Paper text:
The DEAD-box ATPase DDX39B (also known as UAP56) is a multifunctional regulator of nuclear mRNPs. TREX-2.1 is composed of three subunits, LENG8, PCID2, and DSS1, and shares the latter two subunits with the nuclear pore complex-associated TREX-2 complex. Cryo-EM structures of TREX-2.1/DDX39B and TREX-2/DDX39B identify a conserved trigger loop in the LENG8 and GANP subunit of the respective TREX-2.1 and TREX-2 complex that is critical for DDX39B regulation. DDX39B contains an N-terminal motif (NTM) and two RecA-like domains (RecA1 and RecA2) that form the ATPase core.
Full-length DDX39B and a TREX-2 complex containing the middle region of GANP (residues 358–1000), PCID2, and DSS1, hereafter referred to as TREX-2M, were used for cryo-EM studies. The interaction between TREX-2M and DDX39B is dynamic, and thus we employed a photoactivatable unnatural amino acid, pBpa, to stabilize the TREX-2M/DDX39B complex through photo-crosslinking. The resulting photo-crosslinked TREX-2M/DDX39B complex was subjected to cryo-EM studies. ADP was included in the cryo-EM sample to mimic the post-hydrolysis state of DDX39B. The resulting TREX-2M/DDX39BNTM+RecA1 structure shows that DDX39B is in its post-hydrolysis state, bound to ADP and features extensive interactions with TREX-2M involving both the NTM and RecA1. The N-terminal segment of the NTM (NTM-N, residues 9–16) contains several acidic residues (E9, D12, E14, D15, and D16) and binds to the basic groove formed by the WH domains of GANP and PCID2. The NTM-C connects to the RecA1 domain of DDX39B, which is cradled by GANP and PCID2 with a buried surface area of 2202 Å2. An extended loop of GANP (residues 674–688), hereafter referred to as the trigger loop, directly contacts ADP. The R678 residue of the trigger loop stacks against the adenine moiety of ADP via cation–π interaction. Intriguingly, R678 from the trigger loop of GANP would break key interactions between ADP and the F381 residue from DDX39B–RecA2 of the DDX39B/RNA complex. The TREX-2M/DDX39B structure traps a state just after ATP hydrolysis while ADP is still present (step 3).
Numbering used by the authors:
A (entry chain B): 5 to 398
B (entry chain A): 603 to 981
C (entry chain D): 9 to 16, 38 to 251
D (entry chain C): 16 to 69
Write the structure that this text describes.
């Protein structure tokens, strides 16, 4: 009954057990599906039992459950905004206590989801854009992050900073969703500066590593991104196969740009066979097959956001093609016109001797080719030993 | 004119004292401009009294103000800006007329210094964009006006590059280009979400990419475009330029420069020094067998590949990096190459100038010029 | 005659609008009504840090827009409670305090529940005490002498301060007495707060003094 | 679908993690030129006069 629910809420608040209160607020609990708890105006009973601001929060929670029962997610989002604000006031009221951290996990995480629903319930009416509710939820999450991070004087085992990374991830899940980056810089700086960086929970660390690895990949930092995405993929939960596939989607181009090629079994296992041809072409120095494969799955790569990143494999393809030319001719003094013929066989548009020389000069400078160019003889003289050093050492 | 200016100031003071403040968000009232002139009367008289006119806004041969020629000035407001009154803002038709006047009567003037011309046009386009922003204008016509502002700034990014710092600051011009492109992107997204599509978007998105060739993140943004915009020829050219620059493919980069439009070439001119320095580093490392001996490389190859005006400019570029040039053969030496300290002065490329086959007004307008507006303001 | 081979970060301007800072719609409406074009370099660098309630130390030329950064930040992260003062801004001159007050009144156009007050030397303490007693503000802008006088006699409750800000802090900390008063005011305020200090000429000798007031700040110098 | 969903638990200590011992192959970069594409490229080079010396 409602009286039993309110008494249980009061006892949980008095006993200061975060898990029980979080369950009594979270929608994951079956009590939201309980028909008798859903009410339209239960604030009178909440006022009698619960002391402020908890009474307002739980009245808003009951109203939110009633609204969700009717599939009115705009009212649910407004009620959940009231939830977040009331709980933030209550949480700030606490001093040197972090027992209410799981409640913040139950409340804030529930807000964002509702925003999505509200968002996809506002496209139908056409009275709002895509992401306004997400922006409001991001503002609420920023308030929560401020409350958690401002507590720098409490004990190690009694601080609210344990709730930082979680909130950061939530903000990430909005920033990438509404395509609004560059707000991740303060969050990354705060997480790096924090001494609890390696002490957060494994799930939050994996999520943070995945998002920061994506951001570093888009910043052409293919070593930091490689490290972050490797950590995320290695420690991802076995049950969440979708998360492993999503991490691997961005881990593959970074690893291939560093000279590592995924096996066919890996692509088959995680249903990423779109890369299967690409990994082959870069292995064979086949520019034509690489272009055809990137065009065949262009929609998938643009959807993932790695198509133009995958276009950067052209340098490794050039290196492999020139290595194949060197192995076919079996001489250390290779005429540049041989490389021109090889490039024309790959149907490179507007390719001539000047562009071949430019490509070879860049490969030599970056260390991919251990040789020099003789302009008088128009040849390439490579090292007799180790002419093409492995890409892992470049 | 001082008495008229003070009377207009008193009128505005009374009208603003009638204005209310401290309103709720839902009760907000967006501003609707009512100025039928290119410049407000009060601002005209104010700048006439204070002797702050540009050369274009005065009657020739005197310091008196040709009111039909004066254009509203950007002034950054202040903490005491006192809000814009309705008659201090020009509506969208008046803004379009002002932009037409700028592109038809001012952007081709030859008399007067380059500094005065650039300052006048830049400040007046800033004023137009401020009037657009304060009125919450989001329409294809406003998009066109901001597009013309962006085109003017893109042209000046190369036309004025040889001027002294007191005449043209490259950093400020680049910032203005970036702000104009940001406004254009915001309005494009708003109109697309509202069900309206802009014909010229595919052009300026490309400019955006050409303005962010050193920022990898732009790639992500390029993959977020509408399929019509992303598959357009302009965006394809911009992505090709990005790939050429980031892969240090200077031959391909300058081939793209040769086969580019005037504004695309003007945007690509910003990376000439960087790409040439990287190219010289790569060539010096790749054409030298040992650090102790030098190798002769044809100067004609350097001129052709790096798109230099003639042998003299290439010789100066090579000498500024410590390499000896003689008999049309630069002696590439691995131990003699050195990157100079302090950026060298930039000069306009002849090819980009040759690409300008029409007037500046037509390039900024994006097409044939509209008829010159004729509007004598009412006292 | 071929000799065998002998074996042996450019940056771009960042672009963003005020809508990209996820400000409150009232703040964005007030900004666009003010005709702000776009965040400047200092604004783009400092606003994302300042919104999250973290300390910042900024050095930039006059007119770059340092004051607007903290005005927008403190308006964004404001939880207006009747009877409490949550934002305290201090500067060494009355004119600067009135400029800050004008900025606050200018950006809080669509926030009718926000109150701002200014307390400065040259007036009587009775007016400031009456303002505190009758209509308590949420934002207090003042000079260290007047603020210290109002705090010593238990007229200004500084125990609820969440945003401690110094404007043109270099010349305020160069003075010995002003620095001592600022130190006392900082000691009166609670520890859990964000500190933002902005100045036009941050000498390297004063920088340790500025960083003494903060905890792991973001420092910008141009 | 383009969302990183929340994990069912908060910590797993590495016991329940999908193990991929040999995921990235390292011996792909070899001197093997016997594949079909190598034969096609060799035929093209032979056509254009560039032939491996005996
Ligand atoms: N991003 C911006 N766009 C347009 N105008 C601005 C911007 N930032 C500040 N301003 C204006 O410029 C003036 C700068 O004053 P102030 O904020 O005190 O800068 P500073 O603190 O660097 O001296 C302010 O009056 C403000 O109205
Ligand atoms: Mg200032």
């Amino acid at each position: 009954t409602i009286n039993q629910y309110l008494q249980q809420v009061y006892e949980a608040i008095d006993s200061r057990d975060g898990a029980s209160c979080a369950e009594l607020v979270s929608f994951k609990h079956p009590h939201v599906a309980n028909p008798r708890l859903q009410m339209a105006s239960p604030e009178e009973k909440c006022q009698q039992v619960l002391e402020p601001p908890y009474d307002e929060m739980f009245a808003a929670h009951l109203r939110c459950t009633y609204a969700v029962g009717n599939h009115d997610f705009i009212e649910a989002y407004k009620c959940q905004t009231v939830i977040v604000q009331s709980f933030l006031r209550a949480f700030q009221a606490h001093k040197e206590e972090n027992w209410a951290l799981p409640v913040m996990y139950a409340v804030a995480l529930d807000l964002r989801v509702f925003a999505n629903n509200a968002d996809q319930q506002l496209v139908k009416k056409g009275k709002s854009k895509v992401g306004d509710m997400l922006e409001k939820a991001a503002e609420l999450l920023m308030s929560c992050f401020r409350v958690c991070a401002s507590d720098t004087r409490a004990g190690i085992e009694d601080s609210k900073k344990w709730g930082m990374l979680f909130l950061v991830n939530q903000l990430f899940k909005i920033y990438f969703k509404i395509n609004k980056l560059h707000l991740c810089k303060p969050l990354i700086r705060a997480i790096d500066s924090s001494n609890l960086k390696d002490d957060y929970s494994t799930a939050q660390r994996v999520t943070y590593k995945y998002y920061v690895g994506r951001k570093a990949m888009f910043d052409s930092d293919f070593k930091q991104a490689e490290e972050y995405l490797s950590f995320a993929f290695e420690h991802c939960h076995r049950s969440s196969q979708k998360n492993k596939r999503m991490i691997l989607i961005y881990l593959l181009p970074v690893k291939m740009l560093l000279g590592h090629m995924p096996t066919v079994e890996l692509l088959k296992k995680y249903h990423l066979m779109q890369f299967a041809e690409v990994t082959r072409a870069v292995s064979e120095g086949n520019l034509l097959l690489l272009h055809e494969a990137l065009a065949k799955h262009e929609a998938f790569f643009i959807r993932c956001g790695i198509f133009l990143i995958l276009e950067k494999l052209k340098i490794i393809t050039y290196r492999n093609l020139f290595k194949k030319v060197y192995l076919l001719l079996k001489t250390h003094q290779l005429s540049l016109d041989a490389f021109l013929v090889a490039l024309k066989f790959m149907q490179v548009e507007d390719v001539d001797i000047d562009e071949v020389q430019c490509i070879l000069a860049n490969l030599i400078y970056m260390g991919h080719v251990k040789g020099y160019i003789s302009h008088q003889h128009q040849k390439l003289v490579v090292s007799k030993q180790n002419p093409f050093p492995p890409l892992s050492t470049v | 004119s001082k008495e008229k200016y003070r009377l207009l100031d008193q009128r505005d003071r009374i009208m603003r004292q009638a204005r209310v403040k401290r309103t709720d968000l839902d009760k907000a009232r967006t501003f609707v401009g009512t100025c039928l002139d290119m410049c407000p009367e009060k601002e005209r008289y104010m700048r006439e009294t204070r002797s702050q006119l540009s050369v274009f806004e005065v009657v020739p041969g005197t310091d008196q103000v040709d009111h039909a020629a004066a254009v509203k000035e950007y002034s950054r407001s202040s903490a005491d800006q006192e809000e814009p009154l309705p008659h201090e803002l020009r509506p969208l038709p008046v803004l379009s007329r002002t932009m037409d006047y700028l592109v038809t009567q001012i952007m081709d003037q030859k008399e007067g210094s380059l500094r005065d011309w650039y300052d006048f046009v830049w400040n007046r386009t800033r004023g137009i964009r401020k009037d657009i922003t304060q009125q919450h204008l989001c329409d294809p016509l406003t998009v066109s006006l901001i597009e013309k502002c962006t085109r003017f700034h893109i042209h000046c990014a190369h036309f004025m590059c040889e001027e002294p710092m007191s005449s043209f600051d490259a950093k400020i011009n680049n910032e203005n280009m970036t702000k104009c492109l940001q406004s254009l992107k915001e309005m494009y997204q708003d109109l697309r979400n509202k069900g309206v599509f802009c014909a010229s978007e595919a052009e300026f998105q490309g400019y955006n990419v050409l303005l962010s060739l050193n920022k990898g993140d732009i790639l992500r943004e390029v993959q977020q475009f509408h399929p019509a915009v992303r598959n357009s020829s302009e965006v394809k050219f911009a992505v090709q330029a990005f790939a050429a620059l980031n892969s240090n493919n200077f031959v391909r980069f300058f081939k793209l420069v040769q086969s580019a439009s005037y504004l695309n070439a003007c945007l690509l001119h910003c990376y000439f020094s960087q790409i040439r320095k990287d190219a010289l580093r790569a060539l010096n490392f790749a054409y030298t067998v040992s650090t102790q001996r030098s190798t002769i490389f044809p100067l004609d190859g350097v001129v052709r590949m790096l798109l230099f005006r003639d042998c003299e400019e290439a010789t100066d570029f090579l000498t500024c990096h410590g390499l000896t040039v003689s008999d049309g053969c630069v002696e590439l030496n691995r131990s003699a190459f050195l990157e100079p300290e302090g950026l060298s002065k930039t000069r306009k490329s002849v090819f980009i100038t040759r690409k300008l086959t029409v007037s500046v007004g037509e390039i900024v307008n994006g097409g044939p010029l509209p008829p010159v507006p004729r509007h004598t303001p009412v006292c | 005659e071929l000799l065998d081979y002998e074996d042996d970060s450019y940056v771009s301007i960042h672009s963003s609008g005020f809508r990209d800072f996820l400000l409150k719609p009232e703040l964005l409406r007030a900004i666009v009504d003010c005709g702000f074009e776009h965040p400047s370099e200092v604004q783009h660098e400092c606003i994302p840090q300042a919104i999250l309630g973290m300390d910042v130390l900024c050095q930039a030329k006059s007119g770059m827009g340092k004051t607007a950064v903290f005005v927008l930040a403190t308006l964004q992260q404001l939880x207006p409670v009747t009877g409490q003062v949550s934002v305290l801004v201090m500067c060494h001159t009355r004119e600067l305090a009135f400029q800050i007050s004008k900025e606050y009144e200018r950006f809080s156009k669509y926030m009718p529940n926000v109150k701002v007050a200014v307390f400065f030397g040259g007036l009587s303490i009775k007016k400031d005490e009456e303002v505190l007693k009758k209509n308590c503000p949420h934002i207090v802008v003042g000079t260290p002498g007047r603020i210290l006088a109002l705090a010593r006699n238990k007229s200004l409750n500084l125990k609820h301060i969440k945003h401690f800000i110094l404007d043109e802090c270099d010349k305020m900390l160069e003075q010995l007495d002003m620095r001592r008063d600022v130190q006392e005011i900082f000691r009166m305020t609670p520890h859990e707060k964000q500190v933002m200090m902005f100045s036009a000429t941050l000498s390297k000798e004063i920088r340790p003094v500025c960083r003494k007031f903060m905890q792991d700040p973001m420092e910008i110098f141009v | 679908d383009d969302e990183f969903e929340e994990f069912p638990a908060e910590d797993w200590a590495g016991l329940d993690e999908d193990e991929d011992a040999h995921v990235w192959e390292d011996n792909w970069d070899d001197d093997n030129v016997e594949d079909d594409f190598s034969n096609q490229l060799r035929a093209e080079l032979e056509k254009h006069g560039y032939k491996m010396e005996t």
